[PDB]
């Protein structure tokens, strides 16, 4: 039954995102908080392009600044002065421009270093959320992960996580174990199960979802000495909380004199009856023969 | 699974929390590597409590068609079958005479 609602709630979520990418922003800001992530995702992509543009726009703009020379165009320097005097002017521009190139190279090399550190996270997420369904909290999606979808973007990747969110809750009357005869006690082995009882029937479910079923003997260990806040129940009525459990040796004592109850043997049939009556039969035969 | 001075118990490998073993913790690993514990099936309950052979017990003392109702082990109200046929032979001799 879950898959009937999940498809309906997922198809609308896809449409909302594809509409939000369509630049229609303020009309759907009232809908939900899905805008809170798409706005940051768009701002990051805008910034990664603006920063790339500005670096070259700054480099190409330092040719205008003439250094302590006549002008910033060399053809003008060689047009006014002779050959022996222009060499003391050209080098003043040459030294400035070489130092300008060096600072740009030293920045590009630093820029490349961050990208390799960012690629490790991209590979790790591909390895852990796309192929394995990782279970670490606070990792892909803030809830319970199901799957993920990848798509490309300007020199980057764009993920699409898919999580679950609870809507309704249920109230459950929990317990902590079963103590039989005050000394022997049973508790659940796995620490992710809750033993509970509503209006006279006991069931076992999980702690994350609500999937009730019937308890079985294969889920209890022996926890002797019976903490006080347990369930008081005698061993003769243990089958009312744990089905598929019957005492093997006590029934031997009971079912022994009690077979005639369930089910009653046939009367006058060998070898249930007609013993000790054959001495009487012999006596009657002798009496009849004598008579 | 460990045993001190004749009693077997099961604990964890990180902390020391002893308790009693139960049948719900064992699988069947047939062909018995040599460095195991040698024990016969008639005495398996001394290492695993809450375990009994279901069919061997009925093979031992569940013998008659019902267990009883029928003259069974040392039943006092009942009497002896197959203890009148010798007298039947004697009385047959008397009848022939
Ligand atoms: C399931 O199910 C099943 C079925 O059911 C099961 O199976 C089974 O079951 C059953 C049931 O039925 C069970 O049974 C049970 O049981 C329980 C428990 O038990 C306990 O107890 C017992 C007894 O008590 C015991 O046995 C056990 O164990 C043991 O222990 C012990 C201790 O105690 C040990 O040791 C031992 O000891 C002894 C004594 O002591 C001995 O030793 C010794 O020692 C000493 C020192 O110490 C030494 O020195 C000496 O000393 C002196 C003084 O003391 C002098 O000085 C001298 O000089 C010197 O020398 C010496 O030497 C020594 N000896 C020698 C010989 O050496 C011995 O030996 C030892 O051994 C042991 O080891 C142990 N064992 C083991 C194995 O381990 C326990 O503990 C019970 O409880 C029960 O019962 C109850 O209940 C019932 C009901 O239910 C009731 O009824 C009862 O009551 C009864 O009543 C009756 C009436 O009716 C009566 O009867 C009467 O009797 C009388 C008689 O008296 C007396 O005796 C005789 C013998 C003689 O003597 C005479 O003379 C006198 O008098 C008359 O006859 C009248 O007539 C009548 O009536 C009775 O009695 C009563 N009882 C009583 C007891 O009392 C009760 O209450 C039941 O029985 C079974 O078990 C089972 N099985 C098994 C296997 O287990 C199953 O199990 C089930 N399962 C589940 C899981 O559940
Ligand atoms: C729990 O518990 C419970 C209760 O307990 C249970 O239940 C039950 O139990 C019981 C117990 O008791 C059990 O029982 C047991 O068992 C065991 C096992 O078994 C095994 O073995 C058997 C037999 O051997 C079998 O049956 C089985 O199975 C089977 O197998 C088979 C194979 O082998 C198969 O097949 C088959 O085969 C057959 C044969 O072969 C047939 O076939 C055929 O084939 C052929 C070819 O091959 C063909 O061809 C032909 O060939 C020829 C040649 O060979 C010619 O040539 C011609 O011509 C041609 O044709 C043919 O055809 C064919 N046939 C036809 C008909 O077709 C058949 O058929 C087939 O079928 C099968 O299939 C199978 N089955 C199935 C079902 O699957 C197995 O393997 C056992 O072991 C046991 O026993 C043992 O032990 C005891 C003690 O305990 C002992 O005692 C015994 O010994 C004995 O002794 C006695 C004395 O006392 C004796 O008696 C005697 O007898 C004699 C007789 O002889 C003969 O026979 C007759 C019949 C006739 O013939 C005559 O003549 C002759 O001589 C006299 O009578 C004297 O007087 C007396 O005394 C006996 O015998 C002995 N035995 C023997 C064997 O030997 C032993 O040791 C037991 O029994 C049951 O089982 C159960 N149930 C069930 C269900 O199971 C339960 O189980 C439990 N549970 C748990 C979980 O544990
Ligand atoms: C499974 O069953 C087992 C066994 O049946 C059970 O184990 C014991 O359960 C009891 C109760 O849950 C545990 O606590 C005991 O309580 C005793 C108190 O009962 C007397 O006192 C009542 C009033 O006392 C209260 O109010 C006063 C103020 O007025 C306050 O100071 C007290 O602290 C307390 O809060 C009184 O009403 C009661 O009377 C009953 O009976 C009359 C009929 O006679 C009826 O009309 C009443 O309505 C009422 O039902 C009674 O007089 C207490 O005495 C006892 O103390 C014992 O132990 C201490 C040591 O701890 C000793 O020093 C002391 O001398 C006593 O021996 C105890 O505190 C008890 O701890 C459990 N365990 C044991 C071993 O006894 C489980 O709880 C059950 N499990 C379940 C139900 O899940
Ligand atoms: C549960 O029980 C089962 C069955 O009972 C058991 O299974 C077998 O257990 C045995 C022993 O643990 C395993 O090993 C066998 O050992 C045999 C050796 O016994 C003879 O040799 C003794 C001296 O030999 C030693 O010293 C010499 C140097 O002197 C050295 O070269 C040898 O290698 C060895 O180290 C000797 O003392 C002994 O005599 C006994 O009996 C006398 C009374 O007669 C007594 O006075 C002594 O004190 C002593 O108790 C005996 O003569 C060995 O022969 C045997 O070899 C067989 O298998 C090989 C193939 O592997 C064949 O080639 C060979 O011909 C034999 O058939 C074997 O090595 C054995 O492996 C187990 N399994 C089987 C299938 O037999 C389990 O171990 C038990 N589990 C437990 C206890 O946890
Ligand atoms: C083949 O084997 C069978 C065994 O599988 C066997 O069945 C049983 O045999 C036992 C002994 O052989 C019988 O025990 C006897 O019980 C006498 C007491 O009987 C009184 O109650 C009778 C009614 O019984 C019904 O009610 C009781 C509960 O009260 C219940 O337990 C029974 O199962 C019955 O449902 C009375 O019978 C009257 O009523 C019936 C109708 O129900 C009529 O048909 C009768 O004719 C009669 O009117 C009876 O009168 C008694 O009141 C024991 O007698 C003791 O007690 C009395 C006082 O009541 C004393 O006066 C005696 O001196 C004595 O102390 C008697 O000793 C013995 O223990 C058992 O009842 C049989 N069960 C059944 C279901 O029949 C077969 O008998 C056997 N057959 C053969 C041919 O061998
Ligand atoms: C209902 O079924 C019953 C069984 O299913 C059946 O009981 C049997 O009846 C038979 C007769 O029909 C009995 O056989 C007789 O046995 C006499 C022997 O008696 C001597 O021993 C008695 C003690 O017996 C105990 O010890 C022997 C071992 O020695 C053991 O085998 C027994 O099982 C007993 O445990 C003496 O009784 C005295 O002691 C008891 C206590 O033990 C007291 O309660 C008594 O009151 C008494 O004080 C007895 O005194 C004898 O010493 C045979 O008699 C021999 O001895 C006399 C001399 O006294 C000779 O003159 C004889 O010639 C003969 O040699 C007798 O001939 C016969 O064989 C059988 O023992 C009974 N079994 C049981 C278990 O009781 C019922 O008959 C039946 N009901 C119906 C109506 O049929």
Numbering used by the authors:
A (entry chain A): 970 to 1260
B (entry chain C): 1164 to 1260
Reproduce the article's own wording on this structure.
The coronavirus surface is studded with spikes that initiate infection by binding to specific cellular receptor(s) leading to membrane fusion and viral entry. Each trimeric spike has a globular crown and a thin stalk anchored to the viral envelope. Each S protomer consists of a N-terminal S1 subunit and a C-terminal S2 subunit. For HCoV-NL63, the S1 subunit is made up of 5 smaller subdomains: 0, A, B, C and D, with domain B acting as the receptor binding domain (RBD) for ACE2.
In the current study we used cryoET and subtomogram averaging to determine the structures of the full-length S ectodomain on virions. Subtomogram averaging analysis of these spikes with imposed C3 symmetry produced an average at 6.9 Å resolution for the crown and lower resolution ~11Å for the upper part of the stalk. To further assess any conformational variability within the S crown, we applied focused classification on both the RBD region and domain 0 region of the three S protomers within each trimeric spike. This analysis confirmed that all three S protomers in a spike are in the pre-fusion, “closed” conformation with all RBDs lying down and no “upward” conformation of domain 0 was detected. Of the 36 on the crown, 29 are predominantly high-mannose glycans (>80%), consistent with reported N-linked glycan profile on HCoV-NL63 S ectodomain produced in Drosophila S2 cells. Spike crowns could be tilted up to 80° relative to the stalk, with a median tilt of 41.6 ± 15°. The averages reveal the significant conformational variability of the trimeric spike through tilting and rotation that are mediated primarily by a large hinge localized to an upper region of the stalk ~100 Å away from the viral envelope. From our simulation results, we determined that most of the bending was localized to the disordered region (residues 1226–1245) separating the two coiled-coil motifs of the stalk. In our stalk model, N-linked glycans at N1242 and N1247 sit between the upper short coiled-coil and lower long coiled-coil and likely contribute to the blob-like density at the bending hinges in spike subtomogram averages. Simulations with the N1242 glycan removed alone bent at comparable angles (Δgly1242 peaks at 20°–25°), which are smaller relative to those with the N1247 glycan removed alone (Δgly1247 peaks at 40°–45°). Removal of N1242 glycan alone or both N1242 and N1247 glycans reduced HCoV-NL63 S mediated infection by ~70% at three different MOIs, in contrast to the negligible effect of removing N1247 glycan alone.
